[PDB]
Curated annotation (Swiss-Prot), chain B:
Transmembrane segments: none
Name assigned to this protein: ATP synthase epsilon chain
Record function comment: Produces ATP from ADP in the presence of a proton gradient across the membrane.
Keyword set, alphabetical order: ATP synthesis, Cell membrane, CF(1), Hydrogen ion transport, Ion transport, Membrane, Transport
Family: Belongs to the ATPase epsilon chain family.
Subcellular location: Cell membrane
Organism: Chloroflexus aurantiacus (strain ATCC 29366 / DSM 635 / J-10-fl)
Swiss-Prot record, chain D:
Keywords: ATP synthesis, Cell membrane, CF(1), Hydrogen ion transport, Ion transport, Membrane, Transport
Higher taxonomy: Bacteria, Bacillati, Chloroflexota, Chloroflexia, Chloroflexales
Membrane topology: Peripheral membrane protein
Keyword Flavoprotein: no
Signal peptide: none
The protein's name: ATP synthase gamma chain
Gene Ontology CC terms, in alphabetical order: plasma membrane; proton-transporting ATP synthase complex
Function as written in the Swiss-Prot or TrEMBL entry: Produces ATP from ADP in the presence of a proton gradient across the membrane. The gamma chain is believed to be important in regulating ATPase activity and the flow of protons through the CF(0) complex.
GO function terms (MF aspect): ATP binding; proton-transporting ATP synthase activity, rotational mechanism
Summary of subunit composition and partner proteins: F-type ATPases have 2 components, CF(1) - the catalytic core - and CF(0) - the membrane proton channel. CF(1) has five subunits: alpha(3), beta(3), gamma(1), delta(1), epsilon(1). CF(0) has three main subunits: a, b and c.
Curated annotation (Swiss-Prot), chain F:
Protein name: ATP synthase subunit b
Principal place of residence: membrane
Transmembrane segments: 1-17
Keywords linked to the UniProt accession: ATP synthesis, Cell membrane, CF(0), Hydrogen ion transport, Ion transport, Membrane, Transmembrane, Transmembrane helix, Transport
Record's function text: F(1)F(0) ATP synthase produces ATP from ADP in the presence of a proton or sodium gradient. F-type ATPases consist of two structural domains, F(1) containing the extramembraneous catalytic core and F(0) containing the membrane proton channel, linked together by a central stalk and a peripheral stalk. During catalysis, ATP synthesis in the catalytic domain of F(1) is coupled via a rotary mechanism of the central stalk subunits to proton translocation. Component of the F(0) channel, it forms part of the peripheral stalk, linking F(1) to F(0).
Species in which this protein is naturally found: Chloroflexus aurantiacus (strain ATCC 29366 / DSM 635 / J-10-fl)
Coiled-coil residue windows: none
Curated annotation (Swiss-Prot), chains J, O:
GO MF, one annotated term: lipid binding
Naturally occurring in which organism (per UniProt): Chloroflexus aurantiacus (strain ATCC 29366 / DSM 635 / J-10-fl)
Gene transcribed to yield this protein: atpE
Location(s) in or outside the cell: Cell membrane
Name assigned to this protein: ATP synthase subunit c
Subunit structure, as described in the record: F-type ATPases have 2 components, F(1) - the catalytic core - and F(0) - the membrane proton channel. F(1) has five subunits: alpha(3), beta(3), gamma(1), delta(1), epsilon(1). F(0) has four main subunits: a(1), b(1), b'(1) and c(10-14). The alpha and beta chains form an alternating ring which encloses part of the gamma chain. F(1) is attached to F(0) by a central stalk formed by the gamma and epsilon chains, while a peripheral stalk is formed by the delta, b and b' chains.
Transmembrane segments annotated in the record for this chain: 7-27, 50-70
């Protein structure tokens, strides 16, 4: 009734961290396997993987900033 | 403690004990250690390295096969 | 729509449609068998004539 | 060796199957050009120390003919070396059988990195090529003897 | 292109209801889906008669299309099992054709528009319009005379029951008393597997009928909701997906029936 | 009732567009299958 | 209820980070593995990766729009 | 007691973004793997990739339509 | 309390998007990978993929139909 | 409170969609891969494939069944 | 309140569907792949597959039984 | 309320089906694939398979017995 | 409202068993695959297997003991 | 509600032992598959495995700590 | 509604354990598999493995920090 904003912030952060964590996990696993298989193609690989970790993290941050709008404001 | 029998269709290249080897396999470079599991390998044109006791000798191959016992 | 009479009528209609489809497909199977037999006979006759 | 080749060709033609020939060396090439059907593939001018790349052309031509259905069987005829005094023509079935299966169970769980199918499809032509190369080297030694 | 999506002519709401009973003046009252199924069967019979009346070498026209469809169905059935490729072809082919016709009838104009009954009017600043219907008077609901035949549970249940009965009869034709030996054989842990397989076989026709009826009803409801959202040009990809899915489900029903017959046989 | 009329018109237009788009490759496949079937029938007739 | 409005935005953004995050993660893992296996097919790999990333991020965009609509009213 | 439907709206988007997009990502992975080994087969497989993407997007559109229905009554 | 029907509809639709979406993604990725590694077998592989997609979509439509029955019944 | 039966039916049908859906996806992917590797055995495996789906379908049907037991 | 038993039975059946369903899916996919790789040992692995199924479904059966108890007494 | 015990035992049995069900599925798939690859060691891994099975079953049993303590009180 | 502790115990055993069970299944599958690949390292694998199992069991042990602390005083 | 404490403790433990268990299982399976081939790296990867295992335990123990922070104030 | 903050803390910490835990598991398994296949590239691999583990722990610690802010 009165503690719903705390629950909203907690749920927002937890659900924004539960998904992108697995996303960056599989990104890193795939990038590592590609690096081990072909070290000569590393450069593009690195850029692409960072682009990947640019995307999902931002989504998580979006959830976080949404919680930042929920806890305060 | 594995003897590397690098043999070509014309002549034997190497038959000495080697403690560390790489392999330009068609699905990623594989490093074989003296305890490695049995394996069959197709090699595309690449660069095999012999690292017996830190030898680090480059060795250019243009494809072939590898049997790991 | 929950009644036994409607289900019975629909089952009767389905049985009639199944019989009609059975006759229709019994015709095409016989037609295909006749066509295949005629083709085989024609090929055998052509081979015999060539020999 | 040419008499053995003629006997083999006549025996196969008695069974009704057509026969094509691939030739290593000038003498067999001239003989099969004269006595009848021309050889599909010719690889002459091989030295006393030939490389497997010299026989690669004829070997891969035979492999492509077999795998495309052009040839249903393959045989090789070579001068087998017995000793320095006597050497004899010998015929081997290489490609049809292509299964030098071991009696025992020496194989222990070999992991096939590109898969069993890819490893087989890349190792069967190499086995045929090395069999032909060994036959050619044996024939060269027998020729010198 | 991005400025012609006017919403001044849209449905007031989305009418999602179960099967609607027709008036039925004489005895044995019929439903709105029964008339649609009868019309679809009449059209299918007319097409089959047109194909059969002109049958010769080098087919062309509707006969060529019918022959191509029959050949594709025969190839698909023989890819599974060639023992009953011709014996089981009739029921599966008829069910597939009827399902395809019923799915295509749902996209025709007038579905949910004609009411048998046994811009200013639109609300401003709203995503959906509020235009009253013609049969809104006298407290009616504008009962749809035209509807998808597969959108009724009766036809789907009858088709599923007939397919299950045909599969059971074909299995009992030449298999011996293998049902008892395969279900609850009392041989170690195989009895539980046989009981589960028997339960799955019993529930398979209900699953197929529910899947067909739900797919048809959900397609109709999604089309109605998309029409209520925007009057035009929005639901084109959804309509194309529904059109592809109707034929996909029509083929899938026959494929599942053939697979069930093969599994009962083997 | 212009609401149901507009819904039916939109459904008919989308169905016609999708039917034409699918039927173009479907007509190509039907023509290829008819050519193959006529080739088989002509093969039997030409054998006789 | 006084609350039950911050929780809506929280859940929406959290699950819209759950879905598209893992989707983009799998996209990047597969793309980098294909890049490591095949270097010279990079153009089509990048194009299809971007297409899949946009199609997966469409859901996150929808979730963010719905959350903004709920928060603003 | 009153705003629950708003939370429902979030769900009608939120979970609706979990299944499709991840599956979409999976599809893309398979698709890009199919181009990591077989380049010329792209015309055969991109159509099926688009079909699967469209099916997952249809599930997402079902979720969005339900969100619109429960967001306006 | 008051609006439990809309919450139930949203939950059912969201879960029906969650499950069959991942199922369709896995099916399409596997089919596309197999076609890429075997370009002479798709003539039945595509049909099997379509019937598996039909099963998963049937489950999704089960969820959608139950949600519709809750919302309009 | 309102009727919890609607929530129960929704949760049951939704989870029956989640579980067997992923199960069918995995089954179909594995069967397709195996058919693409060794087509000469396809009939056998496709038979087994359908068996698996049946069990998953039953589970989903089970949920729907109890959903009806909550519906009416 | 009133629908607590119904919610309990529904949740139990749904969880016993999500767990064992994916379990038997993995079982069948692995068994089918192993059979395709080695048809000579098929009988043995088939029995093992059945045994695994005879376990996994059993768990689901238990859940259903438990739900039926909650449904009855 | 007066129905929380039913919810407790139902959720406990459902999660005990969730966890060990997927565990059994993965165990059986891996064991069957390895046996099909190499049947000579088959019996040995079967023992470990059963051992793993037992451990997973143990977890389910634990949940079950907790539900038993909720079944009677 | 006095039955919430039973629901707490049920959740603590259930969600505490769904995690380690799947991990145990994956551990056993990997162990059996390694034995298929290399039986001579088998014993060593087995050793590490128990260690992994123990860690998962440790979590399961936790998922039991605090549950009793929820069930009892 | 008066009973929200213990349930929260349960929600601190049960939800805290799901992901760590799967991570532990995946880590041990990866280490076992990497010890099947080249066991002369048996030290190094296991050391990395230990690093990984600690991280997983860290997350798990975090929940347990929070559980105690909910268990006794 | 007392004790709601405890439930919030539990939910946040549980989700942050579930997600990044599986991410850490996947990262470590992939890295050790790559090292086992290619021990020569291990030095290049371990850095990126730590980067990924750092990102996963960053998400988990976001969850834990928001939980701490909620509790106090």
């Amino acid at each position: 009734m009165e503690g719903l904003n705390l629950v909203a912030t907690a749920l927002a952060v937890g659900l924004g961290a539960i998904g992108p964590g697995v996303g960056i996990g599989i990104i890193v696993s795939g990038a590592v396997q590609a690096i081990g298989r072909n070290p000569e193609i590393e450069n593009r690989v690195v850029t692409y993987m960072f682009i990947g970790i640019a995307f999902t993290e931002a989504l998580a941050i979006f959830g976080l900033v949404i919680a930042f709008l929920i806890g305060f404001g | 403690p594995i003897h590397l029998e690098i043999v070509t269709a014309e002549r034997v290249i190497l038959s000495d004990d080697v403690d560390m080897i790489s392999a330009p396999t068609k699905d990623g470079r594989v490093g074989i250690l003296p305890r490695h599991a049995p394996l069959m390998t197709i090699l595309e044109p690449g660069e095999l390295d012999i690292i017996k006791n830190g030898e680090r000798t480059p060795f250019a191959v243009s494809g072939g096969f590898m049997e790991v016992l | 729509g929950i009644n036994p009479t409607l289900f019975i009528a629909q089952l009767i209609n389905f049985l009639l449609l199944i019989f009609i489809l059975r006759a229709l497909l019994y015709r095409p199977v016989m037609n295909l068998l006749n066509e295949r037999t005629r083709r085989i006979e024609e090929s055998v006759r052509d081979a015999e004539k060539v020999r | 060796v040419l008499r053995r080749a003629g006997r083999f060709i006549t025996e196969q033609r008695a069974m009704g199957r057509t026969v094509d020939v691939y030739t290593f060396g000038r003498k067999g090439r001239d003989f099969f050009l004269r006595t009848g059907f021309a050889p599909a593939g010719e690889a002459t001018r091989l030295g006393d120390a030939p490389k497997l790349e010299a026989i690669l052309g004829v070997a891969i031509s035979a492999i492509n003919g077999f795998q495309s259905g052009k040839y249903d069987e393959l045989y090789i005829i070579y001068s087998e070396f017995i000793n320095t005094l006597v050497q004899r023509p010998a015929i081997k079935q290489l490609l049809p059988v292509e299964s030098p299966d071991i009696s025992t169970t020496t194989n222990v769980d070999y992991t096939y990195e590109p898969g069993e199918e890819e490893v087989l499809n890349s190792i069967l032509p190499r086995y045929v090529e090395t069999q032909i190369y060994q036959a050619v080297l044996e024939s060269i030694a027998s020729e010198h003897s | 292109i991005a400025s012609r999506f006017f919403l001044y002519t849209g449905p007031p709401h989305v009418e999602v209801a179960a099967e609607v009973i027709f008036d039925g003046i004489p005895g044995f009252p019929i439903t709105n889906s029964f008339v649609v199924a009868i019309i679809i069967d009449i059209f299918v019979i007319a097409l089959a008669v047109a194909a059969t009346r002109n049958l010769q070498m080098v087919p062309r026209g509707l006969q060529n299309v019918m022959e191509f469809i029959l050949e594709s169905l025969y190839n698909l059935f023989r890819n599974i099992n060639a023992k009953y490729v011709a014996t089981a072809f009739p029921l599966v082919a008829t069910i597939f054709l009827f399902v395809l016709f019923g799915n295509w009838f749902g996209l025709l104009p007038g579905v949910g528009s004609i009411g048998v009954c046994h811009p200013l009017s639109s609300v401003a600043a709203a995503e959906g319009e509020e235009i009253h219907d013609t049969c809104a008077a006298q407290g009616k609901k504008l009962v749809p005379l035209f509807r998808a035949p597969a959108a009724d549970l009766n036809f789907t249940f009858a088709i599923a029951v007939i397919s299950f009965v045909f599969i059971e009869y074909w299995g009992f034709r030449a298999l011996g008393p293998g049902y008892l030996k395969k279900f609850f054989n009392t041989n170690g842990i195989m009895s539980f597997v046989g009981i589960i397989e028997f339960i799955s076989e019993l529930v398979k026709p209900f699953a197929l009928a529910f899947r067909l009826f739900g797919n048809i009803f959900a397609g109709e409801v999604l089309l109605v909701v998309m029409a209520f959202l925007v009057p035009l040009l929005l639901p084109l990809p959804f309509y194309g997906f529904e059109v592809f899915v109707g034929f996909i489900q029509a083929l899938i029903f026959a494929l599942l029936t053939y697979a069930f017959l093969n599994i009962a046989v083997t």
